[PDB]
Design a protein that fits this description.
Keywords: Copper, Disulfide bond, Electron transport, Metal-binding, Periplasm, Signal, Transport. The chain has about 130 residues and is an alpha/beta fold. The protein contains two helices and eight strands. The chain is globular, with a radius of gyration of 13 Å. The structure holds copper (II) ion.
Amino acid sequence: ECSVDIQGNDQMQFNTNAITVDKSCKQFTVNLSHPGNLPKNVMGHNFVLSTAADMQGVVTDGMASGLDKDFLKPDDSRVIAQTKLIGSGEKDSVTFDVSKLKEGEQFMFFCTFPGHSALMWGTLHLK
Ligand SMILES: [Cu+2]
């Protein structure tokens, strides 16, 4: 209820490709964890939400803002929600206002650690 728990693992994958957010949620929370034993600088993960059309841009630029910036460009107005980059045995969360989701989609989530978005992406939808 108003939350989803997402794992990114040592196999460069998330546990789901699809998130639903109920419309009667004021806020929605994403809880990210990283089971496994690989460290952040070789298999780090984060959770980033944008519109599908902004995805490409957000990724290309995170790639370059580097590891210290969570592979995210700071002040990226295109990012609706984001976590920090985490490694094995770490966690992170992000809570955001569901009004930020223009009742019209289309939204995708993904990891911006370099190369990962090939495997680590999914959809988020209202309802
Ligand atoms: Cu990743």
